Ligand binder design. Structure first.
Ligand SMILES: *[C@@H]1O[C@H](CO)[C@@H](O[C@@H]2O[C@H](CO)[C@@H](O)[C@H](O)[C@H]2NC(C)=O)[C@H](O)[C@H]1NC(C)=O
Ligand SMILES: *[C@@H]1O[C@H](CO)[C@@H](O[C@@H]2O[C@H](CO)[C@@H](O)[C@H](O)[C@H]2NC(C)=O)[C@H](O)[C@H]1NC(C)=O
Ligand SMILES: *[C@@H]1O[C@H](CO)[C@@H](O[C@@H]2O[C@H](CO)[C@@H](O)[C@H](O)[C@H]2NC(C)=O)[C@H](O)[C@H]1NC(C)=O
Ligand SMILES: *[C@@H]1O[C@H](CO)[C@@H](O)[C@H](O)[C@H]1NC(C)=O
Ligand SMILES: *[C@@H]1O[C@H](CO)[C@@H](O)[C@H](O)[C@H]1NC(C)=O
Ligand SMILES: *[C@@H]1O[C@H](CO)[C@@H](O)[C@H](O)[C@H]1NC(C)=O
Ligand SMILES: *[C@H]1O[C@H](CO)[C@@H](O)[C@H](O)[C@H]1NC(C)=O
Ligand SMILES: *[C@H]1O[C@H](CO)[C@@H](O)[C@H](O)[C@H]1NC(C)=O
Ligand SMILES: *[C@H]1O[C@H](CO)[C@@H](O)[C@H](O)[C@H]1NC(C)=O
Lengths: 170, 316, 316, 170, 316, 170
């Protein structure tokens, strides 16, 4: 992807993450735990839903028969009709192929973008109190219990509370 | 000690194509090309007329198989392969144009031309058009000379369209299977029929001769048509071999016409029709039939075009 | 102590649609679909010919209303609803093809066919074509038998195109309102007109009969046309009921033809025209008239498609 | 947006910023002040201008009348013409809709990109002398007067000059 | 002390256009619009028939220049400007429809109509169709009255298509250069030819008269055609001026037809053809000829559209 | 570009880099040296190659002649054919122009993306042991010989080995 997170620095996805699209997995004295992120998941879902709302429809444009399957029309006009229809078939097949390829590229890049944004948002929360591993992991220097992990997820984390001990544990 | 970010994934992803790669596996995807046909004409909520044995152009002239379709009303008109326009053999000039008009008509209303006749017979009939005995097109009159061999008189007949919509006017020219038959019916001589309106200008001389037998007949009728504008007049100047209209036709409103080989079904609804049935779908494209009509997904050559609805799938 | 980054915003943004959302508000946007029409034919800088009462096909035959348009020169030709091609009633075979030719012609130059006549009259005239007294199509000659009832002689007339461009050749077949009138004008008998070139091959037999009165006349003239190639010859073999061309037409160059109901205006310029006026715009699309011609924005069904020219608007 | 700055970590835009598209707002002993960034603003404007130069035109392709509004053409050929015209109307309406939607997505993402680039450019200038707030704000540790703020904006800022005192004020 | 990241660059980049800018220089790029034509018909591996002097429609009637093309077999059929359909002058009604049929035919197989004649001559010949002496269309018979001036008898001739594919049936109507010639060949009187099948219905009366001389002849033949369905019958009822078919034609399979002015070449292969040669290319677009046929890149107005295959080029 | 690296914070490209698309240039006690990055180069090349595989082809859609260059068809039908052909020419010329412009934008942004990803990947490797210059350069605090530089390129670099001395040399 363009943002190099999904199928990038994050090695692989989590099959256990059935609660959302993006989530947190932590390690502390109390053990291991997994939780989905609502905002990032919902932003991606709403954007994909928006694409589907646009594409999944046909127009109110009516077309009638201009040739005849039971009694063939005159050959010259029939050949003009077929040439025109085949030309339209070519245009629309090209349009369909390109639309889906473009949308798909954008959809994959969009998901990768949301993953990156979530990573950088957490990075900003934990300033100086943690350092980037490089696998999508943040090594935290101070002790961070389940209430501390939950504060990071819930966006209530206060870095100034732990800064002294974490900075000392550089 | 550490918190790590991630994303979901599945064992069984779905492949899609992008600008840069074929068969990229994503968490989920959905089809954009419709492949499922319903093998019925889904006609729920629509005034539907299934012509069956009646040919669409027969609704105007009235061979016996069209007796119940002389004044139909419709949103949806269905032509069938078994439909026939004729009883005594023949055909319309500019036939497909007229079919296209009638398919969009909303049906037809009929009104008398008001033609009365003297000095000639009005009741030509044939075994090719049976209604418990020999008969003829219900909307037309086969004008003959009073007796065998007699000279048909030089005639003029006029009709003014006093309505606010154009009138569909039909007539026929009879081509007997032989010159002797032409004389027996209309008397000897080279016959002539002229027809003119303020908009229209055309003539007809018959040509008798042996055609191969169709419905037991070696003769033919050339049927012709014109749209007569409001408060315009058509004049028929003829001197034999003329199949006169008894009634004018008027279009009722709007409809759509289809050709199909499958049964009507009033339990399903759809607006996209083809000979094999109804395409019921909200998808933007279809690969079922390039000649589907109505309000349809666009026909494309591809059987499938999967749209990604999830992120790239990266399993461990 | 701190420096903070930001971006601008407004209270009143403009809504646009994206791939992912409808009605996203952005700082500014601009319309891509033209909705503004100018209710005039904007003809600044163009040689313009407004036909008015003259029908485009009348420029070739010359009924009285086309007397000032027999040799016009033009970049832009304007047909009007009130235009009429005829004085004595009738019509052209393949009429719209000929209109399409004349619309692109750049106008017409006329040259004599060089036909001289003996043994017949050349001055047929009618009250339907008045020029202070009964008259006739200025570019044609109504050939009659020397006296009432007299036999028209079997005639042949030839014209070679000695110019480097194709010649437009016209003729007419007269259908009298009755057989007796046909005899009075051209003598009795079944008449015939053949016309051939190295490229063209076609015949005509007249059909007299009562048509409804138009411009006070129950007869009709069938007008016909062909393009005669450089150094090819057309031969007219006729024996009555023939309206002979007096002059050939030559196309001058290039033009565009339109149909309109609004006034010419030499104060505005535009290249996209429709019946209601001129679409003056640099926008890629328009929703004014699907049948606009010239050099136009593409017609689309949407009334508006706003293009974002600013960032997303995020007010406090 | 894809870059998560505009309508992202930056809470909202500034109605007072009438001088450019992107700008700086500072807080110091001398007070508060706002100034627009020329380069970032100009890059965004030039790119949008480029799009308009491409789109705002029609072709030199001439079309003539092929039917007739005063005297109707023959019904069969007329129906072929109408079917063809309606097919073109469908193609172009689809093209127009998709073009504008694609361009609009790109335009919004492009503006968001320029905002992000400006943020990261400043971040690199202030290495170690400041830390990210998370609201698009850089907390500077040393005293930074109007001449110091102007040096950041003008890209003449020298981090080595202040590094010692700022690093000490970790 | 330091490691620095970078990317490659060149002195001589290539310019491309983007959504946002014209003439952005990139490290490399490649053309998407084909401009290179091969000035030959690249026919490697294809059964090719170059008609040369034979006109495509002549393959059915058989003027002397088409003697070697009466039953050809082909994947690719090439018409040339010098090709002529005729020897005695004339033309086909609905000519281009018939050309389109024959271009796609895969060639033709011929079978006798099985017509035998009595009471008339069968060997009409002319100096316009020479085969070391006066001759005639190889697939047709010019039926004449037994002796000069003699009455041609009222005749009927029938042919049933007993094959599984439609038969192409042709006939001709002779228009002599004068009425006297018409009488000399077929006897006096107004002649008539009718032709009907279960599908088809049409008549013909000849019109003699002086046409300008073509191949030394002032007369003309009107050629006509119809497709006769499996187990349907065509009946020809005629009484003079009739050019009878000797053989029916059957289509062999599938082909493509082109028009060209360049030589065949069996050393190159291609599937996109135009009058100036062959477009051999894998590129999606071409700016060579808007009327190219076969399997072609799409024609576009632009001479060049460069696709970037590298990053932006940023030299020091 | 969208990612602001190529023709962005990286001043310019290297004409000497003939071995790949993206690479490393270092400065140490042993001198200067240049080496290309295989993974980033190959990802960009494979993606461009994929675009070409999609675009460089024509369809198996056959069209036949419907008019005639030797003997002109009837004028009315001929004008309908020309109008239809010219309409298709307009559609396809528009399609071609837009396709190439879209692809080109994406291609340039894609290359810029790969450059950015490589930069951030290295940044994560060198955590705390180095600091960003702002010109695409990483100033390393500890002594880094050719084997040390090669370990960064080869992704075998161990930051914990040098962390103490580098952190001390803040
Ligand atoms: C135009 O195309 C149609 C098909 O779209 C052709 O009709 C088909 O002909 C084939 C074989 O000749 C049959 O198998 C099908 O039953 C036909 N399909 C339909 C829908 O009729 C038709 O021949 C073409 N027109 C011309 C003038 O050649
Ligand atoms: C083709 O479409 C045109 C409109 O684009 C039809 O003409 C219109 O007919 C309606 C009602 O019948 C009138 O209100 C309009 O005045 C007409 N518009 C124009 C521009 O003429 C036309 O009938 C259609 N062609 C055929 C053969 O049905
Ligand atoms: C349709 O377009 C063709 C060209 O695509 C026109 O034919 C050309 O006519 C010009 C000048 O009249 C000649 O220079 C060319 O030799 C012609 N080209 C071809 C390929 O024939 C044609 O006239 C147009 N059709 C109609 C009905 O006007
Ligand atoms: C995946 O996509 C299909 C659409 O084809 C949908 O029916 C299904 O509900 C989706 N499943 C999930 C888990 O989102
Ligand atoms: C906003 O857009 C419109 C184009 O519709 C333009 O006329 C106007 O000048 C623009 N205003 C500003 C402040 O850029
Ligand atoms: C650059 O592009 C052209 C395609 O036009 C190709 O032939 C050539 O090999 C390419 N050169 C390099 C160095 O990639
Ligand atoms: C036709 O003439 C009658 C006069 O009785 C009039 O009522 C009607 O409006 C006219 N219609 C038109 C279209 O001229
Ligand atoms: C027609 O013939 C004349 C001979 O006088 C000649 O000058 C002219 O070039 C010829 N044109 C063509 C097209 O053959
Ligand atoms: C025509 O009739 C014959 C009877 O001999 C039969 O064999 C053949 O199948 C028939 N074909 C059709 C299409 O009816």
């Amino acid at each position: 992807g363009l943002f190099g997170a999904i199928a990038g620095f994050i090695e692989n996805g989590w099959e256990g993450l059935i609660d959302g699209w993006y989530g947190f997995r932590h390690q502390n004295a109390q053990g291991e735990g997994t939780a989905a992120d609502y905002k990032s998941t919902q932003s991606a879902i709403d954007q994909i839903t928006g694409k589907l709302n646009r594409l999944i429809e046909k127009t109110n444009q009516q077309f009638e028969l201009i040739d005849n399957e039971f009694t063939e029309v005159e050959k010259q006009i029939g050949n003009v009709i077929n040439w025109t229809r085949d030309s339209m078939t070519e245009v629309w097949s090209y349009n369909a192929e390109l639309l889906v390829a473009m949308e798909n590229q954008h959809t994959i890049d969009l998901a990768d973008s949301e993953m990156n944004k979530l990573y950088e948002r957490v990075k900003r929360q934990l300033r100086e109190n943690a350092e980037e591993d490089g696998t999508g992991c943040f090594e935290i220097f101070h002790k961070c219990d389940d209430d501390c992990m939950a504060s990071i997820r819930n966006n209530t984390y206060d870095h100034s509370r732990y800064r002294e001990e974490a900075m000392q544990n550089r | 000690d550490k918190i790590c970010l991630g994303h979901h994934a599945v064992s069984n992803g779905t492949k899609v194509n992008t600008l840069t790669e074929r068969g990229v596996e994503v968490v989920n995807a959905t089809e954009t090309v419709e492949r499922t046909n319903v093998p019925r004409i889904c006609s729920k909520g629509k005034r539907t007329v299934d012509l069956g044995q009646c040919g669409l152009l027969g609704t105007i002239t009235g061979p016996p198989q069209c007796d119940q379709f002389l004044e139909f009303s419709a949103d949806l008109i269905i032509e069938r392969r078994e439909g026939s326009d004729v009883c005594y053999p023949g055909k319309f000039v500019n036939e497909e144009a007229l079919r296209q008009i009638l398919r969009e008509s909303g049906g037809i209303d009929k009104e008398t031309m008001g033609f009365t006749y003297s000095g000639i017979r009005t009741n030509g009939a044939t075994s090719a058009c049976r209604r418990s005995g020999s008969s003829f097109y219900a909307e037309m009159k086969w004008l003959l000379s009073n007796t065998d061999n007699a000279a048909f008189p030089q005639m003029t007949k006029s009709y003014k369209n006093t309505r606010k919509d154009p009138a569909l006017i039909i007539w026929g020219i009879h081509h007997s299977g032989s010159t002797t038959e032409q004389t027996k019916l209309y008397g000897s001589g080279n016959k002539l029929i002229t027809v003119g309106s303020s908009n229209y200008q055309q003539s007809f001389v018959p040509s008798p001769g042996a055609r191969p037998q169709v419905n037991g007949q070696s003769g033919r009728i050339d049927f012709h048509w014109l749209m007569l504008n409001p408060n315009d007049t058509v004049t028929f100047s003829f001197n034999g071999a003329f199949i006169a209209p008894d009634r004018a036709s008027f279009l009722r409103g709007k409809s759509m016409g289809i050709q199909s080989s499958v049964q009507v079904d009033a339990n399903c609804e759809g607006d996209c029709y083809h000979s094999g049935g109804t395409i019921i779908s909200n998808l933007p494209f279809q690969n079922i039939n390039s000649r589907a009509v109505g309000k349809c997904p666009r026909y494309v050559k591809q059987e499938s075009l999967m749209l990604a609805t999830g992120m790239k799938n990266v399993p461990e």
